Design a protein around this ligand. Structure first.
Ligand SMILES: CC(=O)N[C@@H]1[C@@H](O)[C@H](O)[C@@H](CO)N[C@@H]1CO
Ligand SMILES: [Ca+2]
Length: 885
C-alpha cells in the first residue's frame, strides 16, 4: 500500500474563487478546494487502476465534516467504499480510512456536511494502494435509438394504418385492463365492442349479452374502460383506485344489467396532471405504477394527459446541436425529483447530474406509454418550446440573443432566447425551436397534436419584448412543425395576461387550463376571448395531506360553467400530487358524464358504499359529518389542506408549515371528532375493507393534527406566562400526541417514507451506489428542505411538500419539536435564554443520510388497530375531552 504520488488529477463541478479542485491534491495543507454550489464533490483520477488500502482526508479547519467516498474500476460505476458520519471534529492529523483492497481507477468524495458553513472543503486527499498495471476502459458515450429504428415505430404505424389491427389492439388491451384491475378470471365475462360517437360526443353502452356476459360498447378505448368502470360501480358495488384505496370484491355471479344504458360526455377532453405531479408523486414510478395510473385514467374517462417522460433525451439531442456536450447537458438538467420546475423554467441542475443510462431508459419508458395511450385513445401533451436555454448559451453561440430570467426561490432560472430579434441579428429562437421539435419527433415520433409550454411561469423577464408578439411567434413556430398543433397553456394567478393571450392569432389552436377552478376560477377572461379552455380542480398542493375537498362545488359549478359558456372544451384535474382525498377526484371525473347539476350528498352516499363494499346508517352519519365539516363548501382563498402544526418548524405564533399554506381549521373540531367515534364503533365490521382503513387513518390523523394545534396554543401560553411546570406537562402531552400520530401513520403503506425512498433508490436497474445515494437525496430533500439553504429559507420553500408520513414524523417532525421544547424548558427552569435554532442545518442533516449506512426505513406497514388507536386519541389526546386532559 504505497502512497500514489504521481499522475493524480482531479475535477470538480464548482469552486469558490481561487479554491480550485487541484488545490485538494497539491500536497499543501494550507490550500484547499472549497465548494461554491450544491455540487459538493470532487473526482480524483489515479492515473491507473490501484487496489486501494487507505484514503486520507484533511479539511481546512476544525469543523465536523461528514462525507461519502466512492470508487470506480470500470469508469462508469461508482460504488461506495467508505464514509465518515460520526460527529468527530477534523484536526491536524486528518482522517484515515481503511479500504479493503478495492480496485479503483477513479474516486469520488462527496462532502455532505460541514458544521461550520454551508460550503464544504478538502485541504488534502491522499490515496494509498498498489498498482495493478491496468488502465480504466474508455467509457461508452451516450447512445439512444431513433424512434423510426425501433419496434415501437412499426407498431405505432400499424395501429395508424390498419383499422382492424387497431381495433383488435384496443379491444384486447381493454380485456387486459379487466384482468389487471379485478382479476384474470373475469376477462371472459365481458364482450367489448367499438361503436361510433353519439352526435360528436364520446359515449359508452353497458347491457346484457343474453348468456350472462356483460356487453360494453364505446367509441374508443377510454369510453370502453369508462363503461367497464360504470358497470363495476353501479352493479358490482366495486370501486377502483390503485393509489388511494379500492374495493375490488366481485360478486359470485356477474350481476345482470337489466335495461341497457347509454351515457355520453359533452366534453372533448378530460384532462389530468400538473407539471408538479411528475415530482411530488411520480418521480420514482416504474412502469407498473404508470400502467395502473393509465388503467385508472381510462376508467375515469381521462383522454388528455401531460407527458414529460424522457424529455431529457429530447433536450440532450437539441443542446448537442448548439455546442453542449452530454456532460454539460447533465449539469443543466435537474435531478429526478425536480423535473416539474426544470421544465417550467424555474430551476436548473439541482439534484443532478442524472446518470448516463438515464436517457435511453426514460425514452423507452416514454415510448412504452405512448403505445398504451394510443391503444386507449389517450392524448399525451408533449413539449412546446419557448426559448429556454442555459445561462452560458451565448458563450457557446455568440450571435444568440438571450434574456436573463433572474431567480426563483433562490434558484437560477435558465435564460430565455429573445423570441424575435432585429434585422441583421441572428434568430436563435427559430434555430433552436426548429431543432427542438425535430428532435422530439426523433425520440417519440408523431404521437400527439397537443404541446405544453409556459414561458414566464411564476416570474422571468420579458426584457424589451412585446408580450403579445411573444405568444404570436411561439404559437406560429409550433404550428409550423405540426399544422394541427394545439398549445396547452396554464392559467395560474392571472398569468399569462390578456395581452399575452391576445397575441395568439389562431385561437382554435390554443387551449388554456384554468388551473384552480374549484377555489379561484379564472376562465371568464378566457371565454371572453374565445379561447378554448378547460375547467380544472387543483385541490392538492405539494402533496400536503389532510381532510379537504369541495364536492358541492364540483357537483354544481361544473355543469353551471358548461351552461354559461361556448369555449369550455373539457374538465380536468391539476393536482400537484395525487395522494389525498380520493372522493374529490372520483367526483370530478364523474361530472364529465352529466350536463345537469347533481346532489353531492346522495352521490357521496353511493360512493362510500361501493368504496367500503358495504354501508350502514352509522357510517353514513359519520360521512355527513365529514361533509358538514372538512368537506364543507367554503368561499375563501386557500391552497390545499389545512396544515398540521406537527409538520411546521417550531416557533411562536405558527400559522402554517409551508410559506404559502394555512393551518386554520375552518370547521368545529369537536364536531369532526364524532366521525372518528363512529368509525371506531364500526371498525370491527368494516375492517376487512382496505379503503375503510385508508379513510379511518385519514380522519384519525386529521383528529390528532387538529388537537395538536390546541395543545400547542396552550403550550405557548404556559411559556409566555412563565409557568414552567405547566409547560412541561402540556409539552409532554404534545410529544405523546405525536407518538400516537406516528402509530396511526404506521398502518398505511402509502404513509411510509421507506417506500418513497426505496422507489427512488431502485427506479433504474443496475445503477451504482453513487446514483442510488443521489436519488435518495432527491427524495429526502423534496419533502423537507426542498432545496439547500437559500431555497428552503430565503426562497421560502422549506417544508413546502411536508407529508404526514411514518418515519419522517419520528425522525424529522418530532425531533424538531423535541429540540425546541427542551430549549424552552431549560430556560423556564432558570437557565440561559433559549438559543435560536438553525433549523435548516438540522433538517439538511436528515436530508443527507443514506439508507445503506445510517438507517433503513421499513417498507411494510404495521398491524396497529385503528379502532383501538381511535379510542386512545378520544380519551387522552382529543379536543372534546381536552379540559379533563
Ligand atoms: C414549489 C411549488 O410546488 N410551487 C407550485 C408551482 O410550481 C405551481 O405551478 C403552482 C400552481 O400549481 N403551485 C405552487 C406555487 O404556488
Ligand atoms: Ca491543498
Amino acid at each position: 500500500g504505497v502512497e500514489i504520488t504521481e499522475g493524480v488529477t482531479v475535477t470538480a463541478k464548482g469552486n469558490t474563487e481561487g479554491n480550485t479542485a487541484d488545490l485538494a491534491i497539491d500536497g499543501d495543507l494550507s490550500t484547499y478546494w472549497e465548494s461554491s454550489n450544491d455540487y459538493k464533490w470532487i473526482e480524483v483520477d489515479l492515473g491507473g487502476i490501484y487496489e486501494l488500502s487507505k484514503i486520507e482526508i484533511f479539511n481546512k479547519d476544525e469543523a465536523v465534516y461528514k462525507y461519502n467516498i466512492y470508487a470506480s474500476e470500470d469508469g462508469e460505476n461508482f460504488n461506495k467504499i467508505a464514509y465518515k458520519n460520526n460527529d468527530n471534529v477534523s484536526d491536524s492529523n486528518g482522517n484515515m480510512h481503511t479500504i479493503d483492497n478495492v480496485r479503483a481507477g477513479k474516486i469520488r468524495i462527496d462532502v455532505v456536511q460541514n458544521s461550520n458553513s454551508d460550503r464544504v472543503n478538502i485541504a488534502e486527499i491522499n490515496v494509498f494502494g498498489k498498482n495493478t498495471g491496468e488502465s480504466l476502459p474508455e467509457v461508452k458515450k451516450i447512445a439512444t435509438s431513433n424512434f423510426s429504428e425501433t419496434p415501437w415505430a412499426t407498431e405505432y404505424e400499424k395501429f395508424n394504418s390498419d383499422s382492424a389491427y387497431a381495433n383488435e389492439k384496443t379491444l384486447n388491451e381493454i380485456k387486459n385492463l379487466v384482468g389487471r384491475v379485478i382479476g384474470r378470471e373475469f376477462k371472459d365475462k365481458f364482450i367489448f365492442e367499438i361503436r361510433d360517437q353519439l352526435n360528436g360526443n364520446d359515449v359508452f353502452e353497458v347491457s346484457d349479452s343474453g348468456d350472462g356476459k356483460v356487453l360494453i360498447k364505446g367509441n374508443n378505448g377510454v369510453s370502453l374502460a369508462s363503461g367497464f368502470n360504470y358497470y363495476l360501480k353501479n352493479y358490482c358495488n366495486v370501486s377502483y383506485n390503485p393509489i388511494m384505496g379500492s374495493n375490488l370484491k366481485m360478486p359470485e355471479t356477474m350481476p345482470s344489467v337489466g335495461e341497457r344504458v347509454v351515457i355520453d360526455t359533452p366534453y372533448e377532453h378530460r384532462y389530468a396532471l400538473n407539471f408538479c405531479t411528475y415530482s411530488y408523486t411520480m418521480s420514482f414510478w416504474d412502469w407498473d405504477q404508470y400502467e395502473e395510473f393509465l388503467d385508472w385514467c381510462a376508467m375515469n374517462g381521462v383522454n388528455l394527459v401531460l407527458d414529460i417522460i424522457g424529455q431529457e433525451e429530447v433536450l440532450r439531442r437539441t443542446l448537442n446541436e448548439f455546442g453542449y456536450s452530454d456532460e454539460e447537458v447533465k449539469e443543466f438538467i435537474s435531478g429526478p425529483a425536480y423535473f416539474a420546475w426544470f421544465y417550467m423554467q424555474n430551476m436548473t441542475g439541482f439534484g443532478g447530474p442524472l446518470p448516463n443510462d438515464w436517457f435511453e431508459q426514460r425514452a423507452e419508458l416514454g415510448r412504452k406509454m405512448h403505445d398504451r395511450m394510443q391503444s386507449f385513445g389517450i392524448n399525451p401533451v408533449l413539449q412546446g418550446y419557448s426559448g429556454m436555454v442555459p445561462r452560458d448559451f451565448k458563450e457557446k453561440n455568440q450571435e444568440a440573443q438571450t434574456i436573463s430570467q433572474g431567480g426563483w426561490c433562490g434558484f437560477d432560472r435558465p435564460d430565455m432566447l429573445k423570441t424575435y430579434v432585429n434585422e441583421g441579428e441572428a434568430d436563435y429562437f427559430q434555430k433552436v425551436a426548429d431543432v427542438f421539435y425535430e428532435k422530439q419527433k426523433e425520440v417519440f415520433g408523431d404521437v400527439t397534436n397537443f404541446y405544453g409550454v409556459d414561458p414566464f411561469h411564476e416570474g422571468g423577464n420579458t426584457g424589451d419584448l412585446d408580450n403579445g408578439k411573444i405568444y404570436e411567434i411561439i404559437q406560429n413556430k409550433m404550428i409550423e412543425h405540426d399544422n394541427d398543433a394545439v398549445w396547452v397553456i396554464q392559467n395560474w394567478q392571472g398569468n399569462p395576461s390578456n395581452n399575452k393571450l391576445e397575441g395568439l392569432t389562431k385561437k382554435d389552436q390554443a387551449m388554456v387550463l384554468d388551473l384552480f377552478s374549484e377555489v379561484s376560477p379564472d376562465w371568464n377572461r378566457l371565454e371572453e376571448r374565445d379561447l378554448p379552455w378547460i375547467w380544472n380542480m387543483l385541490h392538492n398542493f405539494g402533496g400536503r395531506m389532510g381532510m379537504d375537498a369541495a364536492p358541492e362545488k364540483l357537483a354544481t359549478e361544473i355543469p353551471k360553467a358548461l351552461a354559461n359558456s361556448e369555449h369550455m372544451v373539457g374538465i380536468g384535474i391539476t393536482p400537484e400530487a395525487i395522494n389525498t382525498n380520493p372522493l374529490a377526484y372520483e367526483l370530478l371525473f364523474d361530472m364529465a358524464w352529466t350536463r345537469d347539476q347533481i346532489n353531492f350528498r346522495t352521490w357521496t352516499e353511493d360512493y362510500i358504499e361501493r368504496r367500503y363494499g358495504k354501508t350502514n346508517k352509522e357510517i353514513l352519519e359519520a360521512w355527513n359529518i365529514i361533509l358538514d365539516t372538512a368537506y364543507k363548501k367554503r368561499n375563501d382563498y386557500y391552497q390545499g389542506a389545512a396544515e398540521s402544526i406537527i409538520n411546521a418548524r417550531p416557533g411562536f405564533g405558527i400559522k402554517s408549515a409551508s410559506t404559502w399554506g394555512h393551518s386554520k381549521i375552518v370547521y368545529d373540531k369537536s364536531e369532526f371528532e364524532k366521525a372518528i367515534e363512529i368509525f371506531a364503533k364500526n371498525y370491527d365490521e368494516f375492517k376487512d375493507s382496505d379503503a375503510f382503513l385508508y379513510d379511518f387513518a385519514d380522519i384519525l390523523k386529521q383528529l390528532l393534527a387538529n388537537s395538536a394545534q390546541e395543545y400547542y396554543e396552550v403550550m405557548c401560553n404556559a411559556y409566555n406566562n412563565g409557568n414552567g411546570e405547566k409547560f412541561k406537562f402540556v409539552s409532554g402531552k404534545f410529544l405523546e400526541l405525536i407518538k400516537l400520530q406516528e402509530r396511526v401513520l404506521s398502518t398505511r403503506p402509502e404513509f411510509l417514507i421507506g417506500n418513497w425512498i426505496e422507489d427512488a433508490r431502485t427506479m433504474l436497474k443496475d445503477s451504482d451506489d453513487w446514483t442510488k445515494d443521489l436519488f435518495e437525496f432527491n427524495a429526502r430533500a423534496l419533502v423537507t428542505t426542498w432545496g439547500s439553504r437559500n431555497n428552503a429559507d430565503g426562497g421560502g420553500l422549506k417544508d413546502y411538500s411536508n407529508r404526514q408520513w411514518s418515519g419522517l414524523t419520528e425522525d424529522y417532525y418530532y425531533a424538531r419539536w423535541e429540540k425546541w421544547i427542551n430549549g424552552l424548558q431549560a430556560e423556564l427552569d432558570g437557565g440561559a435564554k433559549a438559543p435560536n435554532i438553525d433549523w435548516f442545518k438540522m433538517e439538511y442533516d436528515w436530508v443527507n443520510k443514506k439508507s445503506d449506512t445510517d438507517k433503513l426505513y421499513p417498507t411494510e406497514a404495521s398491524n396497529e388497530n385503528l379502532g383501538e388507536l381511535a379510542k386512545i386519541a378520544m380519551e387522552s389526546y382529543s379536543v372534546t375531552n381536552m379540559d379533563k386532559i
